Scaffold this motif. Structure first.
Motif, mmCIF file in Angstrom:
data_model
loop_
_atom_site.group_PDB
_atom_site.id
_atom_site.type_symbol
_atom_site.label_atom_id
_atom_site.label_comp_id
_atom_site.label_asym_id
_atom_site.label_seq_id
_atom_site.Cartn_x
_atom_site.Cartn_y
_atom_site.Cartn_z
ATOM 1 N N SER A 295 15.685 -30.451 -16.217
ATOM 2 C CA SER A 295 15.462 -29.889 -17.548
ATOM 3 C C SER A 295 16.467 -28.811 -17.917
ATOM 4 C CB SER A 295 14.043 -29.334 -17.686
ATOM 5 O OG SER A 295 13.810 -28.294 -16.757
ATOM 6 N N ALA A 296 16.879 -28.841 -19.176
ATOM 7 C CA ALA A 296 17.711 -27.809 -19.753
ATOM 8 C C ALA A 296 16.838 -27.150 -20.816
ATOM 9 C CB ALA A 296 18.953 -28.432 -20.363
ATOM 10 N N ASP A 297 16.313 -25.969 -20.492
ATOM 11 C CA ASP A 297 15.226 -25.361 -21.270
ATOM 12 C C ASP A 297 15.665 -24.679 -22.566
ATOM 13 O OD1 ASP A 297 13.588 -26.244 -19.207
ATOM 14 O OD2 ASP A 297 13.406 -24.254 -18.296
ATOM 15 N N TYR A 298 16.950 -24.333 -22.653
ATOM 16 C CA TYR A 298 17.513 -23.704 -23.850
ATOM 17 C C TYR A 298 18.151 -24.734 -24.780
ATOM 18 C CZ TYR A 298 17.032 -18.823 -22.235
ATOM 19 O OH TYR A 298 16.545 -17.598 -21.838
ATOM 20 N N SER A 299 18.935 -25.641 -24.198
ATOM 21 C CA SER A 299 19.678 -26.648 -24.953
ATOM 22 C C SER A 299 18.810 -27.863 -25.299
ATOM 23 C CB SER A 299 20.925 -27.079 -24.178
ATOM 24 O OG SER A 299 21.699 -25.949 -23.796
ATOM 25 N N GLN A 390 11.821 -26.246 -32.409
ATOM 26 C CA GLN A 390 11.176 -25.519 -31.317
ATOM 27 C C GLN A 390 10.739 -26.542 -30.279
ATOM 28 O OE1 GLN A 390 11.058 -22.066 -31.409
ATOM 29 N NE2 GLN A 390 11.829 -22.037 -33.511
ATOM 30 N N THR A 391 11.215 -26.370 -29.048
ATOM 31 C CA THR A 391 10.974 -27.349 -27.991
ATOM 32 C C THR A 391 10.596 -26.663 -26.681
ATOM 33 O OG1 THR A 391 12.454 -29.033 -28.964
ATOM 34 C CG2 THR A 391 12.013 -29.209 -26.599
ATOM 35 N N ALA A 392 9.550 -27.185 -26.041
ATOM 36 C CA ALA A 392 9.134 -26.754 -24.715
ATOM 37 C C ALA A 392 9.278 -27.907 -23.720
ATOM 38 C CB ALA A 392 7.697 -26.257 -24.748
ATOM 39 N N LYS A 618 5.291 -12.632 -16.108
ATOM 40 C CA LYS A 618 6.632 -12.616 -16.683
ATOM 41 C C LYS A 618 7.600 -13.330 -15.744
ATOM 42 C CE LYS A 618 10.188 -9.264 -18.143
ATOM 43 N NZ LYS A 618 10.626 -10.015 -19.347
ATOM 44 N N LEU A 619 8.532 -14.094 -16.306
ATOM 45 C CA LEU A 619 9.531 -14.815 -15.506
ATOM 46 C C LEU A 619 10.370 -13.865 -14.648
ATOM 47 C CD1 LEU A 619 10.844 -17.281 -18.253
ATOM 48 C CD2 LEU A 619 9.349 -17.878 -16.334
ATOM 49 N N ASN A 620 10.574 -14.214 -13.375
ATOM 50 C CA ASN A 620 11.493 -13.467 -12.501
ATOM 51 C C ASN A 620 12.880 -13.386 -13.124
ATOM 52 O OD1 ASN A 620 9.417 -13.271 -10.632
ATOM 53 N ND2 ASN A 620 10.324 -14.708 -9.155
ATOM 54 N N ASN A 621 13.334 -14.515 -13.666
ATOM 55 C CA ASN A 621 14.656 -14.621 -14.277
ATOM 56 C C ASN A 621 14.636 -15.638 -15.416
ATOM 57 O OD1 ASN A 621 17.373 -14.756 -14.928
ATOM 58 N ND2 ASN A 621 18.084 -15.150 -12.832
ATOM 59 N N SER A 622 14.934 -15.180 -16.626
ATOM 60 C CA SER A 622 14.885 -16.045 -17.804
ATOM 61 C C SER A 622 16.268 -16.427 -18.341
ATOM 62 C CB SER A 622 14.057 -15.383 -18.911
ATOM 63 O OG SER A 622 14.652 -14.164 -19.338
ATOM 64 N N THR A 623 17.317 -16.110 -17.583
ATOM 65 C CA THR A 623 18.692 -16.377 -18.012
ATOM 66 C C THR A 623 18.983 -17.873 -18.208
ATOM 67 O OG1 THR A 623 19.370 -14.422 -16.730
ATOM 68 C CG2 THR A 623 21.133 -15.825 -17.598
ATOM 69 N N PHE A 624 18.499 -18.695 -17.279
ATOM 70 C CA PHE A 624 18.864 -20.113 -17.215
ATOM 71 C C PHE A 624 17.701 -21.061 -17.520
ATOM 72 C CE2 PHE A 624 21.091 -17.616 -13.903
ATOM 73 C CZ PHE A 624 22.397 -17.673 -14.377
ATOM 74 N N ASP A 625 16.508 -20.706 -17.045
ATOM 75 C CA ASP A 625 15.319 -21.562 -17.143
ATOM 76 C C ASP A 625 14.124 -20.772 -17.667
ATOM 77 O OD1 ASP A 625 16.263 -24.145 -15.592
ATOM 78 O OD2 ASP A 625 16.877 -22.446 -14.368
ATOM 79 N N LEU A 626 13.237 -21.452 -18.393
ATOM 80 C CA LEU A 626 12.133 -20.783 -19.090
ATOM 81 C C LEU A 626 10.737 -21.282 -18.696
ATOM 82 C CD1 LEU A 626 13.815 -20.723 -22.616
ATOM 83 C CD2 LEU A 626 13.370 -18.677 -21.239
ATOM 84 N N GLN A 627 10.640 -21.949 -17.551
ATOM 85 C CA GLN A 627 9.356 -22.481 -17.105
ATOM 86 C C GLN A 627 8.655 -21.553 -16.124
ATOM 87 O OE1 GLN A 627 9.606 -26.640 -15.919
ATOM 88 N NE2 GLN A 627 11.284 -26.976 -17.378
ATOM 89 N N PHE A 628 7.374 -21.302 -16.384
ATOM 90 C CA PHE A 628 6.525 -20.548 -15.475
ATOM 91 C C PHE A 628 5.986 -21.516 -14.430
ATOM 92 C CE2 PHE A 628 6.327 -16.814 -18.240
ATOM 93 C CZ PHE A 628 6.600 -17.361 -19.485
ATOM 94 N N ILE A 629 6.312 -21.267 -13.162
ATOM 95 C CA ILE A 629 5.886 -22.146 -12.076
ATOM 96 C C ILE A 629 4.829 -21.455 -11.223
ATOM 97 C CG2 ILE A 629 6.597 -23.497 -10.044
ATOM 98 C CD1 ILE A 629 9.466 -23.501 -11.478
ATOM 99 N N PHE A 630 3.730 -22.173 -10.993
ATOM 100 C CA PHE A 630 2.624 -21.700 -10.172
ATOM 101 C C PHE A 630 2.323 -22.679 -9.047
ATOM 102 C CE2 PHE A 630 2.186 -19.982 -14.390
ATOM 103 C CZ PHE A 630 1.868 -18.653 -14.182
ATOM 104 N N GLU A 631 1.841 -22.131 -7.941
ATOM 105 C CA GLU A 631 1.331 -22.917 -6.831
ATOM 106 C C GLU A 631 -0.190 -22.909 -6.918
ATOM 107 O OE1 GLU A 631 2.935 -21.633 -3.133
ATOM 108 O OE2 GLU A 631 2.037 -23.270 -1.972
ATOM 109 N N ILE A 632 -0.802 -24.078 -6.757
ATOM 110 C CA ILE A 632 -2.256 -24.211 -6.861
ATOM 111 C C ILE A 632 -2.865 -24.726 -5.556
ATOM 112 C CG2 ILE A 632 -2.215 -24.489 -9.365
ATOM 113 C CD1 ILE A 632 -2.531 -27.517 -8.920
ATOM 114 N N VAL A 633 -4.176 -24.548 -5.403
ATOM 115 C CA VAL A 633 -4.878 -24.961 -4.184
ATOM 116 C C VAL A 633 -5.627 -26.273 -4.408
ATOM 117 C CG1 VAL A 633 -6.504 -24.308 -2.363
ATOM 118 C CG2 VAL A 633 -5.143 -22.542 -3.504
#
Length: 633
Positions: A295-299, A390-392, A618-633
């Motif tokens: 994925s290219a989250d900005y473009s 507007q795209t996610a 909040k994202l650790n780093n939003s420079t390149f990618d905009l997805q919030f990633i979580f680990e689930i049980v």
């Protein structure tokens, strides 16, 4: 510097066939007959510059044959003679002094080939014949004539050159300097070479020409335009050899190619040339492609390459053009904005033509013939920004979803919310809130294409109508070119049945007809899925609480949620979220609501690439990618 020169020539010959497989403009395995007047039979190179270009490419093709151990004319002395003789003939026709801001013959702008292709001829001939009696003469001819026609790496016939042009020029230029005895260390320091080094560095940029932060290549200011990158890509290996691995953003460029290409050469048409094309005969040879979802989250590009298919969606942002036209090509916007298709990797590569380019899975048609023209208002190209974009995008290991909200002024104010999910082994597509300008359709129903075929191509599928009638008059499970379509009903959302129609003589369609009344109120909807032939699944989609809250359960471990502006995908122990507003914080309430919607309200989760901040994460780093990633049980 003789060993440096000889090492390079050795490297050049070793990699020639591979390099040639990367080179966009070429003539492969030529067999054209030799001619003492025009180098080859049936061409007029001395009056027709296009024919001169053909002569140039053909000579290069013959160099590759001569150098290829498996070719019949490998190291053939008569071919060696023909090559040097061909170069002699070309040299005998070149003006000396070179012209100033004119082509040697033909009009201006036919300068190409003299500046680009011709010096490549000198280089290829000289190097492939380096062990022969012809080498010294070839080298001397190259030293002399390139000294005239390529006096610097960036100047030729009174013109300064940049971008892709300069990239081509620098390769034979650098070689010409090596032949003159200069070291690569000295050549590097030249003003012209320094310009090229800047041009090939490809640092991440946030706007304008170049490699955007998420590794999508942009040209013409705001156009996703790989055609230009593709053209000079083969030169990168030369610069890396000449000046070291550090002179190119190799990681960035590799990711750029991964984001759109495939080993078979299939590329999403919305990033390709203006005529409407899904194919490059070189892109497959650029890199080794992983099986992955990208994925290219900005473009705004989502791309999946699996063992069975290539699939991609070009999304829409107000920051970038949704379309670019020229004086010839102006009907390609529907394809660029609405292609929602998976291509079977074992399928036939059927490329578009003038009669078929208006038709693909996912295209919303506002008329029966489907022609939607957006002319260039300049004397050359013009690009167009969308009114709304507007795209996610959210992706996991094997699945990826893209949620697009777009409005296009130049396409009769066409608007939609588009929901696409790629998975193994299929693709879900839901359009809802499809709208056009009220009262603009002259009582003509719109239609959303589910399957399309070029009728001239003999795959071994029966026609869509014949398949329908065989299948108890149902278009469910209609197959084309290794892809199978199904309608996907959603309770409380209008999903039309599948019907078959031939618009023009060249095309047959399976489509979902949508009422013009609902198009006027921007409430029209359509929903289908495609499968790789031989694969089926029990995908189900549901409206939960609200028209915009759409939960997809593929039934094989992948769930997705489209809840504009948010999109979510869950697979195994991973969950990814993104907002179409590009928010860098996600509220915990969005997470809770999402998990409730997908039937897992008590889902245990922890952040993987984000941190507790304000009302959520909040994202650790939003420079390149905009997805919030979580680990689930």
């Amino acid at each position: 510097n003789i060993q440096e020169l000889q090492n390079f020539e050795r490297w050049f010959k070793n990699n020639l066939s591979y390099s040639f497989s990367q080179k966009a403009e070429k003539v492969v395995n030529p067999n054209r007959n030799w001619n003492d007047n025009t180098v080859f039979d049936n061409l007029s190179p001395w009056t027709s510059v296009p024919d001169f270009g053909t002569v140039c490419h053909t000579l290069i093709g013959y160099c590759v044959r001569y150098n290829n151990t498996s070719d019949t004319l490998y190291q053939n002395p008569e071919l060696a003679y023909n090559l040097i003789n061909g170069l002699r003939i070309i040299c005998s026709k070149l003006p000396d002094p070179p012209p100033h801001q004119q082509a040697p013959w033909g009009p201006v702008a036919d300068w190409y080939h003299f500046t680009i292709t011709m010096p490549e001829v000198f280089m290829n001939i000289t190097i492939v014949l380096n062990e022969t009696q012809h080498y010294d003469e070839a080298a001397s001819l190259t030293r002399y004539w390139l000294g005239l026609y390529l006096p610097t790496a960036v100047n030729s016939m009174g013109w300064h050159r940049t971008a892709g042009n300069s990239m081509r020029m620098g390769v034979p230029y650098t070689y010409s300097q090596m032949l003159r005895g200069y070291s690569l260390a000295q050549i590097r320091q030249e003003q012209g070479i320094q310009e090229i080094l800047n041009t090939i560095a490809f640092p991440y940029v946030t706007q304008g020409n170049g490699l955007h932060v998420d590794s999508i290549y942009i040209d013409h200011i705001d156009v996703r335009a790989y055609g230009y990158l593709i053209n000079s890509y083969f030169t990168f290996a030369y610069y890396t050899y000449y000046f070291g691995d550090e002179v190119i953003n190799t990681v960035g460029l590799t990711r750029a190619i991964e984001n759109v290409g495939s080993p078979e050469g299939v590329v999403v048409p919305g990033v390709m040339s203006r005529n409407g094309t899904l194919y490059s005969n070189v892109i497959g040879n650029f890199i080794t492609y992983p099986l992955a979802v990208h994925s290219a989250d900005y473009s705004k590009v989502l791309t999946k390459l699996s063992k069975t298919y290539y699939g991609s969606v070009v999304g829409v942002t107000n920051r970038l053009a949704y379309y670019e036209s020229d004086p010839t090509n102006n009907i390609q916007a529907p394809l660029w904005t609405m292609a929602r298709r998976i291509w079977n990797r074992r399928g036939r590569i059927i490329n578009y033509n003038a009669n078929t380019v208006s038709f693909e899975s996912g295209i919303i048609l506002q008329s029966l013939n489907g022609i939607m023209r957006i002319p260039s208002g300049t004397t050359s190209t013009q690009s167009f920004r969308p009114t709304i974009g507007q795209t996610a995008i959210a992706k996991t290991d094997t699945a990826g979803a893209i949620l697009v909200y777009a409005k296009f002024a130049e396409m009769n104010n066409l608007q939609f919310k588009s929901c696409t999910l790629f998975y193994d082994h299929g693709m879900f597509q839901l359009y809802y809130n499809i709208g056009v300008e009220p009262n603009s359709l002259n009582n003509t129903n719109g239609r959303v294409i589910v399957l399309s075929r070029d009728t001239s191509v003999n795959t071994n599928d029966l026609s869509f109508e014949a398949q329908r009638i065989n299948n108890n008059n149902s278009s469910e499970g209609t197959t084309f070119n290794g892809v199978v379509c199904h309608r996907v009903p959603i309770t409380n959302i209008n999903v039309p049945s599948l019907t078959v129609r031939s618009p023009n003589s060249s095309v047959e369609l399976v489509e979902q007809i949508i009422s013009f009344q609902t198009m006027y109120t921007a409430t029209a909807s359509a929903c289908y899925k495609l499968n790789v032939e031989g694969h089926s699944d029990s995908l189900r989609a549901f409206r939960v609480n609200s028209d915009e809250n759409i939960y997809v359960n593929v039934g094989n471990g992948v769930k997705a949620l489209f809840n504009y502006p948010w999109v979510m995908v869950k697979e195994n122990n991973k969950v990814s979220f993104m907002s179409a507003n590009e928010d860098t914080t996600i509220p915990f309430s969005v997470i809770m609501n999402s998990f409730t919607s997908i039937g897992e309200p008590a889902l245990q989760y922890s952040p993987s690439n984000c941190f507790v901040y304000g009302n959520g994460f909040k994202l650790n780093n939003s420079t390149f990618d905009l997805q919030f990633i979580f680990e689930i049980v």
